[PDB]
């Protein structure tokens, strides 16, 4: 898939302003170097995961100052996909670890609900119209399925859905509005798929004068251990993305993906 | 199969009478099967559904309850089982047995049934999630549903469908002898769930007597609550009590509300950019 790469590739064909900037400041080259260094790491011991994090830090240090200063709102398109593409690298080896061919490992809309909204009494009997609500998540590990409804009139109406085992939101900074929105989604997500792990990953924290809502979210990671308001202050050094957190997150995901979950009895 | 007259109450008597020798003795000695047969025959024989015909169905209902409920109450008691509550259910089956031509389609469900509430996923493991993800349909028992039935199939990468029968209601009605606090709260909770699952389902709570100790006020998602006899369940206790009959005009009001609902176009995209508004 390559979420971040795909955004760059399309902006470079389509957006004259942004393609100019990409060439002049060497974004494509830096991106290529990040991908090539990331995709060649085969193992997932602690050291390998810390190598992925170093390449991630390097890429962000190279490219985020360009996104921030050289693009307008041409760049609240570019920056957020970096973490998403990162997770695709981190979890690109799960097929051989767990012995199954996992179709979803990228941003996707995970199933929330099925409800029925027939046009009329005829329709309700013959072929009831329905809605699958799904929620876009920054990163999902899951399966895809087909959902078919059939009435008396014999034809099946089918919808493709994604069922997550893991879903991760990825943000630069976590503020009040977003964290509340995440806690509401967690509630829906746990009714729909009780065995889905739900993580909110941010680099910076920005809850100011306010108290975080820790609803049904399994973990919140603040990768740089710093407050958002430090960013505009005089001579500011951003902490790197902490490799120990990503190592912790990796282990928790993998532990979850290898376990049993549900059982008619045991 | 298709069947709008399943005789829920008749079926209860018939099974009690085959299985419970004590109860079947009581049935014969006090003429319950005869009174029941008379109720069914008078109900089945009313062909129209104008106001007067609906009042006639209610009179037959009143008569049958007057005949049989004092027997259930005093001669059987806890062996009354599902006996007394099914009368109102069988009643609604009579009331709605002829809707097929008015509405233009044969309605498959018109009986107590579990209407679909939600679909959620509970895979056994990562293998199962990809191949064939296990799931749960939550559904709610209602005393009477007018609705359709559908098949829900989920399929993973390993091809084969896991199928479940569901019922999708257009109307769902709870039927009780008396309405108390616990049941009303439980009904209000179900109404919230029921409106997310099937927003175009009409939801009614019908009882004969009211038993709300508290007059504390709660808005709810129940479309109508009918107290058929307009009395309190505290009068029933008292020395020398005459029960008010089931009021025919309320049942007439309920019938008309159901029929208006079943005739309407519920979801109409083209009828929304026409008007301006989505409702009235
Ligand atoms: Br591939
Ligand atoms: Br595949
Ligand atoms: Br919902
Ligand atoms: Br018949
Ligand atoms: Br009672
Ligand atoms: Br629900």
Author numbering:
A (entry chain B): 9 to 274
B (entry chain A): 4 to 283
Study authors write:
BbvCI, a Type IIT restriction endonuclease, recognizes and cleaves the seven base pair sequence 5′-CCTCAGC-3′, generating 3-base, 5′-overhangs. BbvCI is composed of two protein subunits, each containing one catalytic site. Either site can be inactivated by mutation resulting in enzyme variants that nick DNA in a strand-specific manner.
However, after derivatization with heavy atom compounds ‘I3C’ or tantalum bromide, the space group was converted to C2221, with only two subunits (one dimer) in the asymmetric unit. We initially calculated MIR phases, built an initial structure, and conducted refinements using datasets corresponding to the latter (heavy-atom) space group, and then subsequently determined the final, higher resolution structure of the native (non-derivatized) protein in the original C222 space group via molecular replacement and phase extension. Initial attempts to model the density as a heterodimer of R1 and R2 subunits resulted in high values for the refinement R-factors, particularly RFree. In contrast, modeling the electron density as a homodimer comprising two copies of the R2 subunit resulted in satisfactory values for Rwork and Rfree (0.189/0.249, respectively), excellent correlation of the model to experimental electron density, and significantly improved geometric quality. Similar attempts to model and refine a homodimer of R1 subunits, instead, further degraded the model's performance and refinement statistics. Crystallization of the R2 subunit under such conditions revealed an elongated dimer with the two catalytic sites located on opposite sides. An intervening four-stranded, anti-parallel beta-sheet (residues 116–175) protrudes from this core. The molecule is saddle-shaped due to deep concave surfaces at the dimer interface, and there is no obvious region of contiguous positive surface charge that might accommodate a DNA duplex of seven or more base pairs.
